[PDB]
DNA sequence: ATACCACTGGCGGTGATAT
DNA sequence: ATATCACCGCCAGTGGTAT
DNA sequence: ATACCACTGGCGGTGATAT
DNA sequence: ATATCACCGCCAGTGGTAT
């Protein structure tokens, strides 16, 4: 028959068009040479662009590689789908991504991380990309000896703590440990795992 | 029409036998269950018995109502729900392996993103060994560093170095020693590894 | 006056054409927005893009950084020009860039060094990024106890080698060191210059 | 029309000097430097006089004549010509210095590739102390690591580490220090190091 | 050998039309 | 949003010249 | 509770027109 | 090189049913 787009598939498929529109010629790629990709003609890629026939999980997942785009930039409700579905393989756990470059901590991508890899159920976390490694960060964990993303007035750095009397710190992992009160840091969240490349 | 590929009963070979050894513990029928998909009973009778086949929707959702991995009853239909993973979240999925007592057994495939990885992984092994996760380039060139090697049917992480003469300087016992190209079987080199604390 | 474009200044202008039109969209620029950025306007812009006005030096320079291309890529001519110009100010070296990642070298990007960087005249020369390092190799230089871009059996590493009686070397640098024979390492030149960033 | 900026007339100050102090050494008349540049006698004087002023191609074209920098006789013309230099094999050029006996002294302008910083070098400086050159970022946030440093009246290369209470950790010479932030003025960090070998 | 003198060719644009 | 049209200021150079 | 039986709605295309 | 036009195979599901 002929099925009129729920209107959440009409407005998929304008951004999926915009964002094609723009980058045909940055990919170098026309309507027939995405039609050859997906294993259709010309006529079946003009329908999902202009709205005519309805795209699903399958070719949107190609169309976002066709693009290098993700499936979020056209069509938010289907990258929903795609991870409800990946729940059923295994729960891997999108964690907020973060860079720490001369102490700077910056947002970045969301990063896909198994829950094989940790314990304990890290519901708040983060990953921080630093020197070549990634700390998996527990943002809620009881403040005790282990390795810990802190700040020192103004500096974050990966630094391991050891709690002393008198309400004093050890800091280690600096090119100079020293020791301080533990209100001299601000604790961001205890380290709990560390993924490396060859060193 | 009832052209089912001999996988796609297959697939509903091992659904429906996890189906019925399974809907004790659970308590469900195969009308409650076709309550859960907005389907009627004559609607999930077919994908048992193999006269409808799965697609990735359904697939994926009786993994979610069966507390079974949709790979157990379709490793088909999981490597192409993974390959729309990739499409949000670039994740990539890894074949899992663990290494006790220099024996090299199959575990759950892993879900990795592909930001840990500089060189894109087109073939690659994750291995559970001594606590942490060594993940091995299956199709890389011979160079210098740690590779997973087979020693005469004993699966070991070691420390590859070349030397002239196509020979190897194996380590990671407590004595290294020295052997030809040959005489090891390399399976892939490690690029990442990853451990806990505590 | 009006004057015709010696014709390579018209394949100049057909490249920079070319390399717009395929680059407007990945860069979201039009020719009202390129007027802007170099101070003219749209009928000066279109002039330069379709064989009207010739450009010059300053102009290639600037449309070159707005599409974020080299001169080369639409103005070989000038290019040269360029280089010639920069001989007056430092006698920078454009050297043939490398890189080496699993023991594989592979040829990349060219560099540019000045010749301050070398005591000696290098000519034939290196450049081999590596290990967050950048390794300058002579080419043509005598054998002799040194860091040196070696090949043993299919494998390119850094490697210092000693000299040893019965035609034998000591090979370090590696993993493990070894002895073996002259004649079992390949030298492809000497290092004579290490850059690296902060360790 | 004679409207020279007053920079393009200084241009002409110092090249006019630099020909007559030096074409006892050449030998060359301004008709010798005419026929090199293909121009005439009249179309010299103009420039050396400050009647005419100097584009990119003539100067550095004149500097090739006399063994002469452009920068030299022309600092805003040497600007631009590596603002030129930027669009094909992007190089960076940066101050050049030198640190002997604890004096920094200007040095020339060093020519370096972008591709050897991670992070681009918008302020950057190259000092040559010790046989190496360090390449210094001057607009650098303070973090732990390589400096050049003024301390009441020195400068020298140290590594920094920060301290709880606005504190520094000073190391390089026989034995560290610790000061506070305030005590020592942080010119920049350093970001890249390069040395010879024999 | 070198520093003035008008004089001027063409470089590098502008500014309004379409389409 | 691009292309093609006159139109042109105005420093670049020129020759010719008296030092 | 569950496995057959036709029957069929619409999903996901095709294939030729313009322009 | 794109847009819009009919046209449609054909497995997806449905209800109804006898275990």
Same mark, same amino acid.
């Given at each position: 028959? #002929?099925? @009129?787009?729920?209107?959440?598939?009409?407005?998929?498929?304008?951004?999926?068009?915009?964002?094609?529109?723009?980058?045909?010629?940055?990919? %170098?790629?026309?309507?027939?040479?995405?039609?050859? #990709?997906?294993?259709?003609?010309?006529?079946?890629?003009?329908?999902?662009?202009?709205?005519?026939?309805?795209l699903?999980?399958?070719?949107?997942?190609?169309?976002?590689? $066709?693009?290098?785009? *993700?499936?979020?930039?056209? *069509?938010? /409700?289907?990258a929903?789908?795609?991870?409800?579905?990946?729940?059923?393989?295994?729960?891997?756990?999108?964690?907020? %991504?973060?860079? !720490?470059?001369?102490?700077?901590? #910056? *947002?970045?991508?969301?990063? /896909?991380?198994?829950?094989?890899?940790?314990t304990?159920?890290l519901?708040?976390?983060?990953?921080?990309? /630093?020197?070549?490694?990634?700390?998996?960060?527990?943002?809620?964990?009881? !403040?005790?000896?282990?390795?810990?993303? &802190?700040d $020192?007035?103004?500096?974050? /750095? $990966?630094?391991?703590?050891?709690?002393? @009397? %008198?309400?004093?710190?050890?800091?280690?992992?600096?090119?100079?440990?020293?020791?301080?009160?533990?209100?001299? $840091?601000?604790?961001? %969240?205890?380290? &709990?795992?560390?993924?490396?490349?060859?060193?």
């Amino acid at each position: 028959k #002929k099925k @009129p787009l729920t209107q959440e598939q009409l407005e998929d498929a304008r951004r999926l068009k915009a964002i094609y529109e723009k980058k045909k010629n940055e990919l %170098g790629l026309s309507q027939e040479s995405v039609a050859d #990709k997906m294993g259709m003609g010309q006529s079946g890629v003009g329908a999902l662009f202009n709205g005519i026939n309805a795209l699903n999980a399958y070719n949107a997942a190609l169309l976002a590689k $066709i693009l290098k785009v *993700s499936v979020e930039e056209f *069509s938010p /409700s289907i990258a929903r789908e795609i991870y409800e579905m990946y729940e059923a393989v295994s729960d891997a756990k999108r964690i907020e %991504g973060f860079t !720490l470059s001369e102490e700077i901590l #910056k *947002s970045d991508k969301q990063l /896909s991380v198994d829950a094989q890899f940790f314990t304990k159920p890290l519901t708040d976390g983060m990953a921080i990309r /630093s020197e070549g490694k990634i700390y998996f960060v527990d943002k809620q964990a009881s !403040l005790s000896d282990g390795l810990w993303l &802190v700040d $020192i007035e103004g500096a974050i /750095s $990966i630094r391991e703590l050891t709690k002393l @009397p %008198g309400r004093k710190l050890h800091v280690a992992g600096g090119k100079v440990p020293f020791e301080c009160g533990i209100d001299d $840091i601000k604790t961001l %969240g205890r380290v &709990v795992g560390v993924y490396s490349e060859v060193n």
